[PDB]
Amino acid sequence: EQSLPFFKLFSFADKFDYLLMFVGSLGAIVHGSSMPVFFLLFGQMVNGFGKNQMDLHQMVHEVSRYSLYFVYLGLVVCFSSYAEIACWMYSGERQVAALRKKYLEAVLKQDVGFFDTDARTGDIVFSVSTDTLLVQDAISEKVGNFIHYLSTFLAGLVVGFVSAWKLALLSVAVIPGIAFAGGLYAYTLTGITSKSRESYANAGVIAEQAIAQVRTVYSYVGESKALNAYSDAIQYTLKLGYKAGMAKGLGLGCTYGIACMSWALVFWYAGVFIRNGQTDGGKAFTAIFSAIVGGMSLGQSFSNLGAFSKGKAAGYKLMEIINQRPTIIQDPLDGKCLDQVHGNIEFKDVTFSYPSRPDVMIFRNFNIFFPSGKTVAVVGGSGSGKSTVVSLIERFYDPNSGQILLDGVEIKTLQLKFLREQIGLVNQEPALFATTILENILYGKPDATMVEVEAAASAANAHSFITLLPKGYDTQVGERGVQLSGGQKQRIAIARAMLKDPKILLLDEATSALDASSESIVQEALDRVMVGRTTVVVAHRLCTIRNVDSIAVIQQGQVVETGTHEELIAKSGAYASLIRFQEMVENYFYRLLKLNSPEWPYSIMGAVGSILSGFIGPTFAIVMSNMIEVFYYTDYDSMERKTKEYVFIYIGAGLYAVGAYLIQHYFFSIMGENLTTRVRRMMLSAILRNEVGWFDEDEHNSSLIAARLATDAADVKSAIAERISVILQNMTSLLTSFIVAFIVEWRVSLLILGTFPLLVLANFAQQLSLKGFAGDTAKAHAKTSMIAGEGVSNIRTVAAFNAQSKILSLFCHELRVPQKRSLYRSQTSGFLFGLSQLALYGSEALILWYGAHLVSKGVSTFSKVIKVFVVLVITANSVAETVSLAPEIIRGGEAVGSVFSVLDRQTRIDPDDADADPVETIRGDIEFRHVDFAYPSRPDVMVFRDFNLRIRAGHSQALVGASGSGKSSVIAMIERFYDPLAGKVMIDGKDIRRLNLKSLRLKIGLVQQEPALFAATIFDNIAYGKDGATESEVIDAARAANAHGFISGLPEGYKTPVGERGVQLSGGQKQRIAIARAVLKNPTVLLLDEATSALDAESECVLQEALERLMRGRTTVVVAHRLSTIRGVDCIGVIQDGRIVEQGSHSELVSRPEGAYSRLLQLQTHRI
Template identity: 40%
Template sequence: MQRRAESGQAEELARYNKHLAVAKSVGIKKNVSTGFSLGTLFLVLFSAYGLGFWYGGKLIVGEGYTIGDVMLVFFAMLTGAFSLSAAGNNVEVFAKSRVAAFEIFKLIDRKSPIDPLSTSGKMVDKNIKPEITFKDVSFTYPARDDQQILFKVSFKAEVGKTLALCGQSGSGKSTCIQLIQRFYDPQEGGVYFGGVDVKTLNVKSLREEIGVVSQEPVLFDASIKENIRYGRLDVTDQQIYEAAKMANCFDFIERLPKKWETQVGEGGATLSGGQKQRVAIARALVRNPKILLLDEATSALDTESEAIVQQALEKASVGRTTIVIAHRLSTIRNADKIIGFASGKIVEEGTHESLLKKENGVYANLVNMQSFGEKEEKAENEKSVKKELKTQKSIVKSDEKSAENAEEDLPEAPWTTILKMNSPEWPFLVTGTIFSAIVGIAQPLFALIFAKILEDVSVLQGKELEEAMGTAAVKFVLLGVLNFVGNIGAISSFGKAGEELTMRIRSSAFEKYLRLHLSYFDDPLNSTGALATRLSTDASKNAQLEKKGATGSRMALLTQNFFSLGFALVIAFANIWQLAFLCLGFVPIMAGTGFFMMQLFSGKMAMKEQKAYENAGKIATEATLNIRTVASLAREKTFYDNYMHEVAIPHASAKKKEWLYGMIYGLSQGIIFFAYAATFQFGGYLIEKGILPFLAKFTSLLMAVVFGAMSAGQSSAFAPDFGEAKLSALRMIKLFNLPSVIDPTNPAGQRPEKPDVKVLKGLTVSVKQGQTLALVGQSGCGKSTCIQLIQRFYNGEGNIKIDGLDINFWNLKHLRAHIGFVQQEPTLFEKTIKENILYGLPDEEDELVERACKEANAFNFISELPSKYETNCGKKGSQLSGGQKQRIAIARALIRQPKILLLDEATSALDAESEKIVQDALDKARAGRTCILIAHRLSTVISADKIAVVDNGVIIETGTHDELIKQQGAYFSLINSQL
């Protein structure tokens, strides 16, 4: 059992670290390359100095050139070389920009064959006949070109009538819905809207005429009202309310603390599945579309709500062309035409009555699978809804913060705390500092060599002068070698330390995310986009304290500058303290400009900019992850405008402070020349008074101090990097210090020796070992919340006990290892089918994987795939149909052999035939296990040992099916509404 206690957290962390290790390796190699390149540059420069003086000595002795001529050429070379070396430190920025620009321009230049923002194509005529026609359509998804989905499909959805598509999961029904919206173009045949090929129509104009409610509804991280308004941007509040009433979501919204301004969270996470579905229906209805596409539109609703919403949809369908995909008989039996799909082909079509007569037909089998005896079959033919849906109190809690006004409370931390984050790499930091010191003293040493040259020129002549110049040339070459070795050592060492820090911070941050309680992710500040942005940028920016970007050249250069200035001042104080004090007086001004710029980039303005970038990342992530919903709503321009609004904030901020930054940076560079002027003026005075007797010595001191000051002045240019790095570091410190209220990696907690003897107590209901408890009730009444509390995703009031022990005292990892969970909207990862089934487990034998798939009725469709178990599921399982995803999720739960089985609408996405088979498998899987299930369908709950009716977060009835039917209470009403 221990190996089954391994969770997906460790697997995801290992997968993430694998990619980080590659990035770290590349970064270290880049650091070595940068160090070698910069070292080579200085080696060549100092060698050129040496060559220049050696040849200059020959010209002075042999050709009659003066020392002034040589100095003129030398200083011209020196100034140019110094500027070139400074520019060389920033070459990496241009290199990285070129790499980024290549991908960006490649994306920008890419021509989309189906461009929703294009103005080309015919606009849909307002008087167009809303009729959809498929003519010999054959289709294969581009991502899976080895598996054809549709084969010569032809049908017509007539004006004002309802066409129903039925068949097993994966038979091609949802693909037809996508082709109508022109998400793809068929390889053969055509799709026609009012007799016009959809390829010739303007894409946005086409989609504006279509209302869609999909099987897995997607809501955006905005208020309920804003989500409905996405259906039609010019809609009035009154029209929103009317659409909500039609979708049966008006009452529950009105009972929320913030009503229509309630934030639904990322993906609608703060709403129940049924509530999300109804808001999505309202969003579709508010469009007043000509074409209505319903892909399992009521799959997440309880039976009572379904009946009411189904009536509303039938009313909404009047005068519209409606295409329905559904597995429930009640949803499609009244359709004007029903088409049966099998393996991508149309195998039958007709009405409810005509298809029932077809023996072993697709539709006939569907009906037979949903019949529960003579009494139910008779009642099924009676079209009635016995009462109006009761108003419900939402379990959604109002968040005190909104995405618009939430402020990030960052901790205060001294630089020592921030720098300690790199303490494990202290050997590399020490090594880098030593090499940087070696490079840093090169400039002052250069000044001393130069002073010796001036002195030799003034006292030596002929051969002696030529030899002295030759000796100086050799010293310059040695300085070049010193720079070569020092730059390689410094940049490589700091780069190594920085890459290790970046990887460790990213890995630790990701691990922390995996350990945090789920309520952390409910906070608007912590959306997926914002967290991804922080994970990507904050770790690398934080490492700017040791390195800049992808290399260690910045930290190496800063350390070099520090030692250069320090050694220069030592030389100055050792020779003439008066001049040294004058030069030292300019250092605070240089340091002050750098400090001011750092504050400019790390204050409240910087936090506002960072927040804007996070919001932009959130918008981009949300839009791209849910691009199908964005496309079906034709809201690409809206999300683009929202994105540009966010990125405009830092742009405007940059424009406001660019003049200030320019002025301060100009001062930091101009102060060097002020130091020149003051030093020459004061030096002249000292020479005049005889305090400084030799001009050569004065010149050497001046060069030593000024070159050191110039190096220090360069450091101020990096102040913005350090300002941003500090902000990122504080955010990381806050994350690492944040305690997880419910930490699955915490080893504390009890591990009972008999986890197979279970009693669950909560909401005044209990279920014993081996029994099945069914929770029923209207959408949003609290059923799914019970499932989450059992897994201890949240802490609630009262007691939930397993084996008589409060789950708060269980070891969390041990608790969850014994629980199998299949949810209403299954989540698959971008891995193979086998990897998804074995998620978080060691490799199992193939026969065990196959057995789990057979139990979940997934074996057959997997075997028909070209790559079988190695088929990649795509992002969020996008390469599979809803029913296929659900069966993979069921197999993933069953292979763990859990002691407790939690099923939250586990068969909601399955067709009737698959549902019956999977339900039989789940019934077998329940044997000997404690099972708690949530379901709206009678066939799923009728055999439960105990049924609990939940209403407004309270259990109002418990008993068996027969006992509750005799009571003729809430359960009786729910059953009647289903019949």
């Protein structure tokens, strides 16, 4: 799209924010420049040991002096880090809060006409939340990291170059090799990740179809069949994961080998330089380490730059809306007002077209009149602007060509604080803000008194309902503690309209919630208002239009006829069509480890690699310490040989690192991939062996369960394998570091042992600061975003009942709270970070001072203090890296908390066939005992209560839908889709819950309400009903539905993608293949299903052939709300209130039972 200039992001600011940014920038610069100063001081102190091991007293003096300097640097870093973190966090929060406040103010003031619910409501709210979060991300703290790391870069180059020369050059020239190796590793990792993502996308599109059409999958046994394709796909993904692990192991090995070569070359050339006499033993350390930390500085700064660019794009997207100038302007200085209005609404040559798209015509020559103190009814046959008149009287749309007068006063010169204040409006499903009930009433009146609130609500059919709450007019509709979310939501909008007492009362089609007696209660409340008021009626259905004293009907751009409710019905003038159209109507980890038992050989090699890496670490530390000690030798001839085998040791260590990392990562990747494949197979097998009622909930569709297998199945293997590897490696390294430490010197190692918690804590804080101290900022702004969304989503309601100022107070309060939270969090984080850094530097100074003093009392030398110190510092760094994994393991109970839940979530039916006696042949004895059933998703359904029916062999049934009185539940209880609440089901003289389900399901087939095809070419979509037949009977059964000519025309013969990424077929073709499957399987019991007019097959010919071919020797059950093509030659029934009300064949039900079945005849008649 487009972006904004970056320094235009800091527009909504203040003097205080300028000061905060200044302080934060100064702190960041000081911090960054301070770290290489620490390197310089350490180099000088090491030189102080090195050049003074004959002048013992001077050693003590200089070591104490530089320990004091370390303390000073610790103090400076403390204060600087506190300053940068606190100032930047607080400034970012203040500015983003100001931006949110400005943004929400614009929407309310900006005109309402452009909000046409054409996905605009969902766009704006997500824009607000997510994009304000993005802007805050790009402003608050990442600028601090950017400045800090760029400052470390600039200070790092300067310090080495002024230190001596020629090594800040070599190291800076070499570090591009490390950078390129890391970049190549990242590129390969991204490529292999994309390939694995594609492979699992194929696997998921193969799998998720079974879950969605579970009823078809269960009916036609495919549990073994479905799992084989998943097995093949997951084996492909397993091979790809093996390759991925191999590649990442090689990448780590190669990058560490290149690092070892770099260190070897740098140390060798340094040792060359000291030999000549151009550099001491302390300057080289400073130069090398300064250059390397500069390299990491560039890495972090580049990451920050990417984040900044993304934030810039988001910020432009936000700032697009604010500056949009509106059309209608409310202004006391220009807009005037009147008094004692009369409601004489008149339209004079009103023409308008939608500004978004004016190609269509809406109100071409629109001219209607609204009387005063009366009621009018505007109704249209379709979307011809019947719902637009309310969007035109309300000043929602300016008439681009025309004039409208109010009692002789034209309305374009009236402010939107007086005209709208005299009008009351109700809309479709009036949304209620997440506040108390008493707040909703206050929309109609800000604050006058309380007695009128109770008086007006009395005549609103809600005074009794509000009393059914153990609170003082307090109810939080947001937090669903008390769930008053029934279908008949409380009509508090009527009460809030009553409180305002508007002269004008616009109406809307507020009946779209499956109107019933509950929706018929509100008719009296609606009829109680139109007394002495200039009100209208806008309706879509004429069921409740029976009481109107004047009805005007518009058809195309203009009104056709007017009059009362006496002549509109008569003369059949453009009104008979409307009524006719109306009439057509915690041992989990051990269990996981046990589940990985067969893959134990790989675990041993993985562990071996772990110990080998643990030995890699301290080896590097010891060799570096030896080089540091060697630099101070006096015999230059001896230095060459020692540096020679030290360089060879570096080369050997590089090769060793390559090999060890290869072994460890490869074998642990193999183990992890095998474990995740096994758990995926087990989880899918468990899921397919579940109850249908488990899929009925809104969280167990094909879009969530199939998504859990994506992220949860990989997280478990990641957790187990990676945590085991890292813990083993670092634990071995730590043990090696102490064992080498406590042998070379046992006194100095005790102080470092004592101060070790401080060092590990400080390094932990340093590594934690890289990802920011903010934390779940989306959750902090969880109520402001909700208030903004509710204010924007129902802005149509907010336009009336003028409340453009009351929302801002709530927004201000709920913005004030997170400002305090951010203030406290920022100050605490700054203080703790400063204390941790001060502790680190003070501890290091104390360690070195005590070491130097211990050297003085002739029981040590310049060989053991330095070695133990550097080894223990590096192993403290490694242990700090280890500790950071603890939050990852702890993180939300890392995703094996539900992986192992569904894996052992026992079902209700439990179709398991452990020892139940199997069935060889079913002859047909379908009989229903006393059975009641309720939907597990909604227990409030009591459609079934003591149902009873009997079906004999070799016949059919024609159970009508009966206005959807549980029509789609008899088919779900012939087979074990649902468990009856009470009673049993007897089939073939035996209980249903005593026999294997597979045998009963493989000889009974159904016809689904919505036929569907699997995600494959059309060769098994016809043969899915029977396994064993390949080409013999498929063609024979293909001539059951007249679609052979349809399949004759196809490029690739029979094969064609229809599920996805291929040709798309019509609705009438899927049922042909479904009937083909039904006739190919050749079952004993058949089930038919037609409902909700979902056939969508004009000129019905496929059904007639099927009903005369599939009934030869198959028992079928027919259900259809339509009273057509359901001539059951055996029996027909009607289901009412969970029991049979009449039984018999079709002939016995036509003319014999004058009664409820007559409803059926008159129904078919109206329909025709």
